[PDB]
Amino acid sequence: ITHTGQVYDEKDYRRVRFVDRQKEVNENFAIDLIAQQPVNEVEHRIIACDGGGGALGHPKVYINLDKETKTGTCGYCGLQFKQ
Amino acid sequence: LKKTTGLVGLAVCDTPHERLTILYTKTLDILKHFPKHAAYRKYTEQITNEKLDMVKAEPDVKKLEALLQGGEVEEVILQAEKELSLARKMLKWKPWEPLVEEPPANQWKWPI
Amino acid sequence: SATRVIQKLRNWASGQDLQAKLQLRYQEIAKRTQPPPKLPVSNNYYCTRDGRREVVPPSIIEKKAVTPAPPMKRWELSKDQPYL
Amino acid sequence: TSVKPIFSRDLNEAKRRVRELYRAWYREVPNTVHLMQLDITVKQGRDKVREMFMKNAHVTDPRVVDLLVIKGKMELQETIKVWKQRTHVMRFFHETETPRPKDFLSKFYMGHDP
Amino acid sequence: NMTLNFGPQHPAAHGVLRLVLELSGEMVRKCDPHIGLLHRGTEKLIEYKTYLQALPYFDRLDYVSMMCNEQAYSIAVEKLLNIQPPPRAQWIRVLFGEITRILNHIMAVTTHALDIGAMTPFFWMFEEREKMFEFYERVSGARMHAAYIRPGGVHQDLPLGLLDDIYEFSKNFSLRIDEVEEMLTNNRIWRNRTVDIGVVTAEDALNYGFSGVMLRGSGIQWDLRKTQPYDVYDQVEFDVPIGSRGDCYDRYLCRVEEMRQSLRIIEQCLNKMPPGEIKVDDAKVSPPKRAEMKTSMESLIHHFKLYTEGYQVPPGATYTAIEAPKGEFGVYLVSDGSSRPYRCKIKAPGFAHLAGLDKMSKGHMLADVVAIIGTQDIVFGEIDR
Amino acid sequence: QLITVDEKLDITTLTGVPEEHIKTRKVRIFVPARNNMQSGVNNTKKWKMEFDTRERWENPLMGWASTADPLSNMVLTFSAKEDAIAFAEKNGWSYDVEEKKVPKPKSKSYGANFSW
Amino acid sequence: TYKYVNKVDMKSATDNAARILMWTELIRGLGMTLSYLFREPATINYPFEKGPLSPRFRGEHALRRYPSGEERCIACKLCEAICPAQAITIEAEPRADGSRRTTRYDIDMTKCIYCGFCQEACPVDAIVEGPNFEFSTETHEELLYNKEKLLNNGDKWEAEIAANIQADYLYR
Amino acid sequence: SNLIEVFVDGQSVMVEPGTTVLQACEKVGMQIPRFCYHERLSVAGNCRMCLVEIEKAPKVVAACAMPVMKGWNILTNSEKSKKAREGVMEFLLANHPLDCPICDQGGECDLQDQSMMF
Amino acid sequence: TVRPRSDVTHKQLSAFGEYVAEILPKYVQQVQVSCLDELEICIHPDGVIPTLTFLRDHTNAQFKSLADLTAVDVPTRQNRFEIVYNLLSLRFNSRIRVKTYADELTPIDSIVSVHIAANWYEREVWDMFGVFFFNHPDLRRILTDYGFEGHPFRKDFPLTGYVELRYDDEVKRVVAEPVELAQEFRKFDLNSPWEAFP
Ligand SMILES: CCCCCCCCCCCCCCCCCC(=O)OC[C@H](COP(=O)(O)OCCN)OC(=O)CCCCCCCCCCCCCCCCC
Ligand code: SF4
């Protein structure tokens, strides 16, 4: 099953495809790799997130780690920042 | 004189001054049958006149060419002969008349 | 790099100097990994520098006959090599 | 209202052309079958010709019939010559295409499109 | 007579042609070339594609001349927008335009020969063409249909080593030309096959709309790089190689000279290329730089809109002609205010030339026709469009 | 010259459209409505003639959307009801004209919200 | 400026007949081809010495991944709105982390034109166009790449891509 | 006939007393770039992205709240009313977070367009 | 970022436009020099051979070469097709556009007599848009398939046509087939709704 499901039901005839063949499926799910990352602690109320790069990363957005209740997550990297 | 007019077809024409005078003079006439005030007659007679004016004012070909501001005279002729044909053709198509039909409405509005 | 005799074979048979103009790149070639570059980048209101909006909708428009433009000046034979 | 004629002035005048094409085609079908080694029979083909010349048999605007002839003649030229191969000519026979049913119950029974 | 349909697959010409012929014995009575064998619908598809996403249609019209086809469109879209490319970009387009004329001519002269039967000139020059491709690959990223001469400039600056490598190629290329020169110019066999074949008279060439080396080969003086200058050609010096006796040979000799004259223009461009940026930088027309779009909001909005929607060029229509290696390549772009064009008539130097084949190849045998197509440098992408 | 004819200039036989795409297909002349998501009124000014929506299905192999309606991506743009009805009648399609819906004039005043 | 290209004493007449009868002028061509069998062929040993390329070389697509391991693609649709061959379908969802990612991504590599309009539009450097050009296939189905033949593809060349991105980022 | 006459870059339209400057431009057909003004919502004047320049007048007025008066010619594409938009758009964008490839009002943005046009 | 232009041209050409309009008053409906510095003389369809002959053979306006002949199709206009002829004067180094209007059922004359370049372009206009050229030697499809039905560049023709081809073993021939596309072409409605200030 791909990180996004897709697993064919046993009855699905769409399974012949993989006979004498196999299924291209990436073992490195980004749902988990990003969870295997340390919440980036910060001092400032707001922080940037250039994507760990200038022009080699993602557009630069400032995240409001203002509530410890929630670790801001840049919509691009999925990196949680711990105030 | 000139061994070869550059352009392939146009062949060296001896007696350039003469060929021209005849072609230009014929034309100055065909225009005559045109309505008194028809731009063509009014303008083409203005040109043909200036060229006949130089064709007879200067007797050196190379010189003449610069004045007529054409290419090799063998060309100034090629053109003189074609205007004559347009002049004959124009007197039949009577372009001087009023417009045939005004465009249908909105037949020339690009940002449509 | 070829035995001089063999290459003099190619210079004599060709009739032209051939060690000079190689069709093969030995050290002639620029090496890869060129140092990183730094490309070159008030009153800069776009309303002054508007190419797009500067254009206007097309103009619609005794007397002496006028040519479309002054007759083209005839070219002249090349000084370095008139005939080749 | 007034309209310039393409080539014919009255529908009757034009039909003269329509017939001068029918004849041409008819007298050509036999040739094609043989030349392009087509397999359909002379009769069969000649049938198609009438069908087409017939399909268009309802327009009354001379200019349109003046125009379909031309297109029509052009198609002869190509066919008279062998500019068109077997594939081209045989395409007039929907050999592979399964003719679509028309009965409502026959369509409702297959395909959401009407 | 005998209708031998020259092979659509036949190795001769560009393999996308039919050319039904009437064989009056050995000689050919008439030719009726049946092009259309490669009409992909280029002009129809462009109407459904934005101005940037149509540039690619152009490098694929005359695939031998890549960046000059684009230079037309790019000039046409610039004129509609009333914006001009920056100074460095204009020199780069002239630098790349001359490399394309050398590569088109190496294509035309060498392939004409293999049709005639000379096989070695093609191999020696094609290695010289792979060196030139590498220049396209090392500036654009592709060896072909680079899509580098975009509206407003080139897409990216020249890499740090390109101009030195173009000097080394241009330095030694001249010997490669006359090496082909000695092989084909004086041979009995080539002159007989080419001289006095397909003579076209001067007025007939203008009337048939030939507009190319076919026009200049007959002695007419017209280049479109010196008559109606584009870009910065007005600042580079070159000699048009006109010719007399409009015959295949004179046309061959002209094509060999333009390769030499282009080396003179490439020489000036390397010697005088200005420091500057490669694309006009009003972000409305050319996309914002990678660092700017990732740090400033106005640039992200301008990148998003330009890539997703388009330039939205002002309503109008223009016919812009540049001297493509084959001849005058022109785009009649009709534009509504929309981001995607309304019509784009690609004038192909080649639709006119192939029409001339029947007139030019008259009183000629089957073998002459192979030379007649070869001397029109016709590639069927431009004709078929 | 100047022959006279009385047809609605049906060029249905010069167009070249397969019968079934000229018979069972209804064009819908209409002035596109505004994208509530934006407030720009420049996309609601020219009359469009779009055709009926037929089957859009799924390619078994990759899951893409496939279709057999050749006239699916067709949105001819006219400049007036009159010129759209004419084209549809010209080509032999059936039409469903929809009158334009310009917002009526709604009077707006700043002070009004200060009354009591 | 224009240039003409093609425009008897016994010494000359004999010279002409010495170049027509005892052909001496087709000999200046035979020695010209004899000048080349003795040179070094330009052929490269192909499979072992692949030809030269540039960090700009546009080939097989791939989806880069953030060093952390988070897919870079945030399903903008800024890369099929420009793809002129109309090759890409990137149907997306919230991925159940609350984040924003693809459930679908696609190239039909039998429609793509390797124009790189997708690598220069991507504001995040997710989709690139790698330096592969040995990926021929015996079948049609192996070219309709999915998000997992582009992501593990990008999980392959990332050592080889990033060097070329870092090598050309300034010029871009 | 209480129409009052007012000039839109010269078209000289005639409008009911009490129509806003923005409304006067609409009947000629011109669109004032606008934010915070919705036809069926009260005029607020918050954005002031609609500043225009009535003629021979000292300052720019808000087309959303200014009642057009008699014989004021609106100049919607002047050299001033463009610096009054080139400089407002500078501000809206300044504090804006650049996540347009997150903002699902990507092509449905009345703020990128007006930035991208005015 | 503002084109380097010469006003000399606008004027010179404008003046020629008045010259042509005076010399041919009967056929020219509107003459305008656009701001791109190009000229366009719009002629009644009947003026196609008179207007082009005057330009091909007049000493003060020699327009020897036909750059191209194309037909924009604006479906709204009654006369949809707008045949446009672009001509070049080698003598005066200037170019002109003569554009006339033709409907589906009203043919316009053929200039093959005036310029033999048009023999092919006119065939392409017939094949692509369906305009018919009167007394044109050998008008017949230049670009489309031998059996193609319909004129392709018409705005009312589907991008992808109605027929496609495949090889059918059962019949051993390349058979046509109603078009079924595996991925319809996503039509993007990309067009902003905020108009640009002129
Ligand atoms: C006074 C003493 C007593 C009397 C003694 C006798 C009188 C004097 C005799 C002098 C003889 C001079 C040479 C004559 C024989 C040579 C062949 C010949 O005559 O030339 C014919 C032809 C010329 O070609 P072209 O320029 O077109 O001339 C015709 C113009 N309408 O030539 C050709 O074009 C043929 C070309 C064919 C392709 C040739 C390719 C090169 C071949 C290289 C071969 C190398 C090896 C040759 C030796 C082999 C030995 C086994
Ligand atoms: S690839 Fe780059 S562009 Fe295409 S969607 Fe993912 S992020 Fe947006």
Ligand code: SF4
């Ligand atoms: S390369 Fe060009 S074509 Fe291939 S996907 Fe990226 S954009 Fe679409």
Ligand code: SF4
């Ligand atoms: S889309 Fe409009 S709103 Fe969403 S971010 Fe980009 S600009 Fe701000």
Ligand code: FES
């Ligand atoms: S629109 Fe914001 S106040 Fe006029």
Ligand SMILES: [Zn+2]
């Ligand atoms: Zn981030």
